[PDB]
From a paper:
Self-complementing bipartite fluorescent proteins (FPs) are useful tools for the detection of protein–protein proximity and for localizing fluorophores to membrane–membrane contact sites. Here, we report versions of circularly permuted green FP (GFP), red FP (RFP), and mNeonGreen (NG), which are split into a large fragment composed of nine β-strands and a small fragment composed of two β-strands. In each case, the large and small fragments can associate in live cells to form the complete 11-stranded FP β-barrel. We further converted each of these three self-complementing FPs into bipartite calcium ion (Ca2+) biosensors.
Starting from scpGFP1, scpNG1, and scpRFP1, we constructed self-complementing bipartite Ca2+ biosensors that we designated as split green, neon-green, and red fluorescent genetically encoded Ca2+ biosensors for optical imaging 1 (sG-GECO1, sN-GECO1, and sR-GECO1, respectively). The basic design of these biosensors is to have a calmodulin (CaM) binding peptide (CBP), and CaM, fused to the N- and C-termini, respectively, of the FP7-8 small fragment. The rationale for this design is that the N-terminus of β-strand 7 and the C-terminus of β-strand 8 are in close proximity to each other and, critically, are close to the position of the key permutation site of GCaMP and all other single FP-based Ca2+ biosensors. Purified sG-GECO1, sN-GECO1, and sR-GECO1 exhibited ΔF/F min values of 10.5 ± 1.9, 17.5 ± 2.4, and 11.2 ± 0.5 with 39 μM Ca2+, respectively. Purified sG-GECO1 has absorbance peaks at 395 and 491 nm, which are attributed to the neutral (protonated) and anionic (deprotonated) forms of the chromophore, respectively. Absorbance spectra of sG-GECO1 and sR-GECO1 revealed that their Ca2+-dependent fluorescence changes come from population changes of nonfluorescent neutral chromophore fraction and fluorescent anionic chromophore fraction. We next carried out Ca2+ titrations, which revealed that sG-GECO1 exhibit monophasic dose–response curves and have apparent dissociation constants to Ca2+ (K d,app) of 306 nM. sR-GECO1 has a biphasic dose–response curve consistent with K d,app values of 3.85 μM and 1.34 mM. To gain further insight into the structure and mechanism of sG-GECO1, we attempted to determine its atomic structure by X-ray crystallography. Although we succeeded in growing diffraction-quality crystals, we were able to obtain only a partial structure. In this partial structure, the electron density was observed for the FP domain but not for the CaM and CBP domains.
Numbering used by the authors:
A (entry chain B): 17 to 74, 90 to 152, 156 to 234
B (entry chain A): 59 to 88
Write the structure that this text describes.
Amino acid sequence: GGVQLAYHYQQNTPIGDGPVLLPDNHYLSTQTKLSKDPNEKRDHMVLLEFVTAAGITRSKGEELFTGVVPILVELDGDVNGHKFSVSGEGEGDATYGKLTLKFICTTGKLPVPWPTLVTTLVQCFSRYPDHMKQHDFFKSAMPEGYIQERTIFFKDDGNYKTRAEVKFEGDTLVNRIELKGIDFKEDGNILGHKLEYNFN
Amino acid sequence: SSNVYIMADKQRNGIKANFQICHNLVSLRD
């Protein structure tokens, strides 16, 4: 149908033993714009993202997000034996659900399409409306942080399994990720780089 | 615009999420 489907299963577990908010059922609405730095020779992705919690008409951690917060992202990846590393930096403004980040493949050519890594590469920067404050698990787990685990099934192709630790290092929000990808078809849409450079 | 559906996971004192991402294919490869 002109698209490649990627089904995400996700679970998040607090790292610390302090109180967290367990939410009522809801969803995050995410828009993402991908671009390139004309002066950047390395394989890279520039990302502008806005995320807003929604779905309900109606702790100390959210205090850490009232202003602009610097972000660091580090990913270690293995897809079908292809090793690669990605570093990102930028900032988040949860008041506006806003992320601005630049990611670099530090090992050379990224062996998978950038758009397949977007979801892996900090939902604590989501904008929770005022009437929805009590459902923001992500900020409530801070600063000690949370573990984010996913499996991503690419329909008719391979899968990613990810484990990430998201927590504060001083004033900086850090996302450290390990990604393992398996059973990808060598000339499929992922390893064959058949995806458009964008994200809807 | 994607939608991430979030639900509490009381057992792990955390949350569960499930969603679908749709990646566009380039043309003229098939």
